[PDB]
C-alpha cells in the first residue's frame, strides 16, 4: 500500500510567484510502480516530468508555467502500484477575498422596441484585468433556435479597468413572446463558465405621468433658461426619455436625465433637466418631453409642451 | 556554498488550506561541516519546538516548519536562516492575483452643520470589510499637527455579509474655514500596507445657488396627496444641504428624495410628497438651501403652495 502527497513551490517573500511552479509528488512494499500526471483529467507529456527512485522512495517533479498554475487547473499524481491506481490532486490555493467576475445583461430600451420597433439586448461585463480581454462571451437562445450575429468591443476605462460589451439584436415578435436569452462567458483563467439570463418584464404595468416646467428669468442668465421634466408613477422601470424642439429630437447628450427610483407608494419617478438657449426659444417657444413605456397609452407615447414666456 | 530552497504543503483539490501549513526548507550541496538552522518570523526568531531537522551526506539537510492556518495566512514573512561557518530564503502567504482591496471615503461637513448649526463634522468611512479585520483603527491627524477632539467609532453589519466602520470627527468652526486638511489613517494587522486619506475645504470659485420650487398638477386619483419638487442649480461647489420646512419647522430626510450633485453644462432635484392634512394646517412649504456662497446668512429659500 503506497502513500502519496504533493509539495509545491513557495512564494516570494513579498507573496509573489516564481517564473515557474514545480510540484513534487512523493510516493511501500517494493515491486512494480509508475507515476502519471493528469491536467484536469487529461494526461500530460511524460517529458515534462523527471522521476527518481531510491531503494522504496519514488518521486516525480512536474514544472508548470505560472500562466497555467494561476489558471486554476487541477493536477493529479496518478500512481499505479503493483495492481491498482491511487490518486492525489492539487490546485492553486484559493484567494482569501477574491473579486470574481461581474456581468450585466440589459433589456431593450422602449424607444427601440416600441417607437423604432427594432429592439436590441446587450451582455455587459465590467471591471476585469487586461489579460482577461480575450474572454470570449458566447450567445445562446433557450428555444434552441440559432442566434443572429452580434458585436464585440473592448474599452479602456478611467480606473485602469477593462469593459467588454456585446450587443445582440433580437426579433420583435420573439422578445414579446416571453423568450429568455443567456450570455455564456469563457476564459482560460476561469475554470468554470459564467452565465446570466434576461427576459421581458412580466407583472403590474402602470402609465407614466409628465409634468413640465420653465424656470423664471434669473438676473445673471440673460441668454439662457433651464427646463425641467418630472416623470413618475410608472411600472416597471424600463423607460426612455427624449426632448423635442421644433419637430426634431435632441440628442441624449443634450439633456441630463437620472435613473428611475421607486416612489413612497406605487410607481417610480425620474427628473430631467434641459438647458436651452435664447436663440432656441426665439425660433419656436415650444419644447416637448416625451417618454416611451410599456403601459403608456395610446401608442406608448406621452408628452407635454412648455414655453419660456 | 550551500543552496537554500523552500517548499510548502500543497492545497486541497478544491483549493482549500489544510489545518497546518508546512514550510520545508531544503539546504543541499554544501561542503560538509558545521551548520545551524534557525527559523525567523517577520525578522525575529521562532523557537525550535516547531521544527524538526534531518541531515545526510555532497551534503544535504532538511528542516520542516509546522505552522497553523492562522499563522501562514496572517500575511507575515518567514525566512529559513542557515548559518554555515549567512544564507537565507524567504516566503510569505501567496498574495491574491486579483485582490478586491480596501476602499475608504472621507467626506466634508454639511453647510447646515457648518453655518446654521455651527457644529461641523467630517466622517471617515471604510466599507466591504470582513468579520475579522473588524478592529481596523481609524486615527486622526492634521496637516499642522494641532490638537483634535475625541472621535467616535461605529460599525454596522450590512446586507451582503460585509462590515462598515465609521468614524466622525468634529472640527472647529473657524479652523475648518481657513483651510486646514485633516487626515484619516486606516491600519489593521491583516492589512499589509497602511491606507491614507485626507480632506479639506474646496478650493474653487464660489457661486450662489438658484432655487426654484414647483408643484405637480392634480393627477387623476391623486387628491389625498400631492407631490412637491424643488430644483437647485448653478451653485459652486458641490457642497450643499437641501431641506424642507412646513409650519416653520424642518422635516426629516425620509419624507423627501433628493438626488446627488451632477455637473451642469451643479444641479440637484428633491421630491417631497405631502398629505391632505399637511397643507390644511399651513399651506406653505419652504425649500431651504444652505450654501457657502448664499446670502445673507448662507441660506436661500423659496416657498410653494398646493392651491
Amino acid at each position, epitope marked *: 500500500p503506497p502513500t502519496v502527497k504533493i509539495l509545491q513551490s513557495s512564494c516570494d517573500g513579498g507573496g509573489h*510567484f516564481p*517564473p515557474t511552479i514545480q510540484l513534487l509528488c512523493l510516493v511501500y512494499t517494493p515491486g512494480t510502480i509508475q507515476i502519471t500526471w493528469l491536467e484536469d483529467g487529461q494526461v500530460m507529456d511524460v517529458d515534462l516530468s523527471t522521476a527518481s527512485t531510491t531503494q522504496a522512495s519514488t518521486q516525480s517533479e512536474l514544472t508548470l508555467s*505560472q*500562466k497555467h498554475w*494561476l489558471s486554476d487547473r487541477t493536477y493529479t499524481c496518478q500512481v499505479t502500484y503493483q495492481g491498482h491506481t491511487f490518486e492525489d490532486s492539487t490546485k492553486k490555493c484559493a484567494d482569501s477575498n477574491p473579486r470574481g467576475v461581474s456581468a450585466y445583461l440589459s433589456r431593450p430600451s422602449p424607444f427601440d422596441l416600441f417607437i423604432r420597433k427594432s429592439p436590441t439586448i446587450t451582455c455587459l461585463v465590467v471591471d476585469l*484585468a*487586461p*489579460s*482577461k*480581454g*480575450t474572454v470570449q462571451l458566447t450567445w445562446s437562445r433557450a428555444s434552441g433556435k440559432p442566434v443572429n450575429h452580434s458585436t464585440r468591443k*473592448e474599452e*479602456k476605462q*478611467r*480606473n*485602469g*479597468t*477593462l469593459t467588454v460589451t456585446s450587443t445582440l439584436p433580437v426579433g420583435t415578435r420573439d422578445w414579446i413572446e416571453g423568450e429568455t436569452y443567456q450570455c455564456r462567458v469563457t476564459h482560460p483563467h476561469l475554470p468554470r463558465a459564467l452565465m446570466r439570463s434576461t427576459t421581458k418584464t412580466s407583472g403590474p404595468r402602470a402609465a407614466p405621468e409628465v409634468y413640465a416646467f420653465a424656470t423664471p428669468e434669473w438676473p445673471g442668465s440673460r441668454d439662457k433658461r433651464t427646463l425641467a421634466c418630472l416623470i413618475q408613477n410608472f411600472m416597471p422601470e424600463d423607460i426612455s426619455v427624449q426632448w423635442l424642439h421644433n419637430e426634431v429630437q435632441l440628442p441624449d447628450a443634450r439633456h441630463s436625465t437620472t435613473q428611475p427610483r421607486k416612489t413612497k407608494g406605487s410607481g417610480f419617478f425620474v427628473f430631467s433637466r434641459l438647458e436651452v438657449t435664447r436663440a432656441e426659444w426665439e425660433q419656436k417657444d415650444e419644447f416637448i418631453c416625451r417618454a416611451v413605456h410599456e403601459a403608456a397609452s395610446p401608442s406608448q407615447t406621452v408628452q407635454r409642451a412648455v414655453s419660456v414666456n | 556554498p550551500p543552496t537554500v530552497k523552500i517548499l510548502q504543503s500543497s492545497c486541497d483539490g478544491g483549493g482549500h488550506f489544510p489545518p497546518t501549513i508546512q514550510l520545508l526548507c531544503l539546504v543541499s550541496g554544501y561542503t560538509p561541516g558545521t551548520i545551524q538552522i534557525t527559523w525567523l518570523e517577520d525578522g525575529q526568531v521562532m523557537d525550535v519546538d516547531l521544527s524538526t531537522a534531518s541531515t545526510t551526506q555532497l551534503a544535504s539537510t532538511q528542516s520542516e516548519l509546522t505552522l497553523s492556518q492562522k499563522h501562514w495566512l496572517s500575511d507575515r514573512t518567514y525566512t529559513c536562516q542557515v548559518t554555515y561557518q549567512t544564507f537565507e530564503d524567504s516566503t510569505k502567504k501567496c498574495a491574491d*492575483s*486579483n485582490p478586491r482591496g480596501v476602499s475608504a471615503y472621507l467626506s466634508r461637513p454639511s453647510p447646515f452643520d457648518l453655518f446654521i448649526r455651527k457644529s461641523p463634522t467630517i466622517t471617515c468611512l471604510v466599507v466591504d470589510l470582513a468579520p475579522s479585520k473588524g478592529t481596523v483603527q481609524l486615527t486622526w491627524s492634521r496637516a499642522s499637527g494641532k490638537p483634535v477632539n475625541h472621535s467616535t467609532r461605529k460599525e454596522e453589519k450590512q446586507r451582503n455579509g460585509t462590515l462598515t466602520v465609521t468614524s466622525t470627527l468634529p472640527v472647529g468652526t473657524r479652523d475648518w474655514i481657513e483651510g486646514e*486638511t485633516y487626515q484619516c489613517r486606516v491600519t489593521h494587522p491583516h492589512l499589509p500596507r497602511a491606507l491614507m486619506r*485626507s480632506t*479639506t475645504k*474646496t*478650493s*474653487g470659485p464660489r457661486a450662489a445657488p438658484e432655487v426654484y420650487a414647483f408643484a405637480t398638477p392634480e393627477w387623476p386619483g391623486s387628491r389625498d396627496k400631492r407631490t412637491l419638487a424643488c430644483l437647485i442649480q448653478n451653485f459652486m461647489p458641490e457642497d450643499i444641504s437641501v431641506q424642507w420646512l412646513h409650519n416653520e419647522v424642518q422635516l426629516p430626510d425620509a419624507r423627501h428624495s433628493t438626488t446627488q450633485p451632477r*455637473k451642469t453644462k451643479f444641479f440637484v432635484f428633491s421630491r417631497l410628497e405631502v398629505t391632505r392634512a399637511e397643507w390644511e394646517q399651513k399651506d406653505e412649504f419652504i425649500c431651504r438651501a444652505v450654501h457657502e456662497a448664499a446670502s445673507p446668512s448662507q441660506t436661500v429659500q423659496r416657498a410653494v403652495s398646493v392651491n
Partner: antibody
Amino acid sequence: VQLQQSGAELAKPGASVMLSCKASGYTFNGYWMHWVKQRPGQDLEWIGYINPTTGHTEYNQKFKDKATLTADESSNTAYIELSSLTSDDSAVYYCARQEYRHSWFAYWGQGTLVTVSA
Amino acid sequence: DIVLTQSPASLAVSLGQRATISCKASQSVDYDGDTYMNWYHQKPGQPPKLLIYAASNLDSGIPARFSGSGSGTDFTLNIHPVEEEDAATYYCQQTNEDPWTFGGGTKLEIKR
C-alpha cells in the same frame, strides 16, 4: 518590473524603423504599454497604447499616420514602427507601462533616441 | 484634446524654502467624483518618475515634502522644505480622457 528599449538608431528620410520594448518578468493580470515622444527640449507628447493580450489599439490624431503599434504576448515585447521618417521624427521615444487598475504610469523605459538624417 | 498649461515655466527657490507650481486645465479633469491628475518630474537623461497621482496622493517612496491639492481646472504642487535633489523639470498630466496630455513643464532652480 523593468523596461529596456532598443539602443540608438539612425534612419534615412522616407524610410521606416521599428523600436522594441521588452518587459522583464511575467505579469498575470495584463498591462497597457504606451509610447511617449519627447522632441529635443520640448513638450511630452502622447502617442498611444496597445493591450498585447488582444492587440486592441488607440492612437492620437497627430500620430495616427506616423506610428504603428504591435505587440507579442508570449515574449512580453511591444513594437512601434515609424513610417515616413522626417527631421520632425528626430526625437527621444519612451515606452511607458500602465498597470491594471492604475490611472497613471507605473514603469518607464530608458528611451530610444532616433536621429533621422542623411 | 484636454490641454494643460502650467505656470511658471521657470522659477528659483532658496534651499529650505517653499516651491509652488500651478497646473491649469481647459476642462474638468474630474470624473465620477474622482480627480485624474498626476505629477511627474524629469531628471536629465532619465525618463520622468511619478511624484503624485490623483492630485492629492503621493506615490510609494516619495518624500513627505511634496503635497498636491486642487481639483477641477486648477491644481497646485507644493515642496516644503526644498532640498538640493529636487532640481528637475516638473510636468503635470491628466488621465481623464484620451489623448493623455502633459503640461509645458516647470524648471525649478535651487538657489544657494
